[PDB]
Design a protein around this ligand. Structure first.
Ligand SMILES: O=C(O)CNC(=O)C(=O)O
Ligand SMILES: [Cl-]
Ligand code: NI
Ligand SMILES: [Zn+2]
Length: 353
């Protein structure tokens, strides 16, 4: 089909919008999907150079980080499990000082491949500290383009209808990273989209697996961590599992890599597995969002069954509003719709024309 013909390689795509294109978020997501970006599970958007979401970042040093986490990694042979050790609350100037410490600072290198090799070589040593999951935003209250605090997608239906707020999902998170800080392989909660903006600092590097191959990754993971898989159907949602690209290559898992610079956006797509690490001191802001296309993913997302605090969104409202003709069938457990990961979201239809 025409969707199979676009981005047939499922490679990560980079987009350079004009300020006019950049204005409407959902519309531009539908555009990049109409170009097949979603097939990679991950895409980069460089905003127009004339766009800035904050005046200056010089006031941050006093901002608080309630629960920094020390990332202890255990494993070998490209397979690792990451345990978080919550450290005491600390300011940003403290975190920055510790991050630029001779102990934790970035190593010297030339090509990115050298720093990547060093990452996968020393990942288990000198556990760094990640200032992750900090409630807040660095956007100025007047920025209307791609504002992570108010993107105005249909995910807003969760709060609007129920008042439920889910920190980091329909609210923004800040991530203060230092060298060697990692995010494990995962798809977003409820297999939503995510948006990640790198405010400032050293780059953040990403690996992505096309959604149409996600299941393969899962199978591989189950073979490597059979205990975890036995305990929980979706153990990858614990966000503790690190797998090196050489392991993926070795077992035929298709993936792609991209490096994220300050001032750039990354979009992750439904059921797009991703992982990565930070090069040094930096600050990112992210949240989740949805499109009509996500609804089916939401209905079929395989959720963690071993933790009672995992994120779970009621899909009822979305099915009633956008899939009325199926609601009954779905409530009776008979909606056997099959997801085609290559299709773009219906909102993109006008771009397809
Ligand atoms: O910033 C991080 O450490 C991890 N970010 C994501 O997984 C994301 O934006 O989808
Ligand atoms: Cl195991
Ligand atoms: Ni993510
Ligand atoms: Zn679980």
């Amino acid at each position: 089909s025409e969707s199979e013909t676009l981005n047939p390689s499922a490679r990560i795509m980079t987009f350079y919008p004009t300020m006019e294109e950049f204005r409407n978020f959902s519309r531009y997501i539908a555009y990049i999907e109409s170009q097949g970006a979603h097939r990679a599970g991950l895409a980069k958007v460089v905003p127009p150079k004339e766009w800035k979401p904050r005046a200056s970042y010089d006031d941050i040093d006093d901002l608080v980080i309630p629960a920094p986490i020390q990332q202890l990694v255990t494993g070998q042979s490209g397979l690792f499990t990451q345990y978080n050790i919550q450290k005491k609350a600390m300011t940003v100037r403290e975190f920055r000082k510790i991050a630029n410490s001779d102990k934790y600072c970035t190593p010297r290198y030339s090509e990115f491949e050298e720093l990547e090799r060093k990452y996968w070589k020393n990942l288990t040593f000198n556990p760094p500290i990640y200032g992750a999951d900090v409630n807040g935003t660095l956007y100025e209250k007047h920025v209307d383009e791609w504002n992570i605090g108010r993107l105005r997608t249909i995910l807003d239906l969760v709060e609007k209808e129920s008042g439920i707020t889910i920190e980091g999902v329909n609210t923004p998170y800040l991530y203060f990273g230092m060298w060697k800080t990692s995010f494990a392989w995962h798809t977003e909660d409820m297999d939503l989209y995510s948006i990640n903006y790198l405010h400032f600092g050293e780059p953040k590097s990403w690996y992505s697996v096309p959604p149409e191959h996600g299941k393969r990754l899962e199978r591989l993971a189950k073979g490597f961590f059979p205990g975890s898989a036995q305990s929980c159907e979706a153990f990858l949602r614990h966000k503790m599992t690190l797998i090196s690209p050489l392991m993926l290559k070795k077992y035929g898992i298709p993936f792609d890599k991209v490096t994220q610079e300050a001032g750039e956006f990354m979009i992750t797509f439904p059921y797009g597995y991703h992982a990565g690490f930070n090069h040094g001191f930096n600050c990112a802001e992210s949240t989740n969002f949805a499109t009509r296309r996500w609804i089916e993913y939401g209905k079929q997302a395989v959720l963690c069954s071993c933790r009672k605090d995992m994120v779970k969104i009621s899909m009822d409202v979305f099915v009633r509003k956008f899939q009325p003709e199926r609601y009954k069938l779905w409530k009776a457990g008979k909606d056997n719709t099959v997801i085609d990961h290559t299709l773009p979201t219906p909102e993109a239809a006008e771009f397809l024309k």
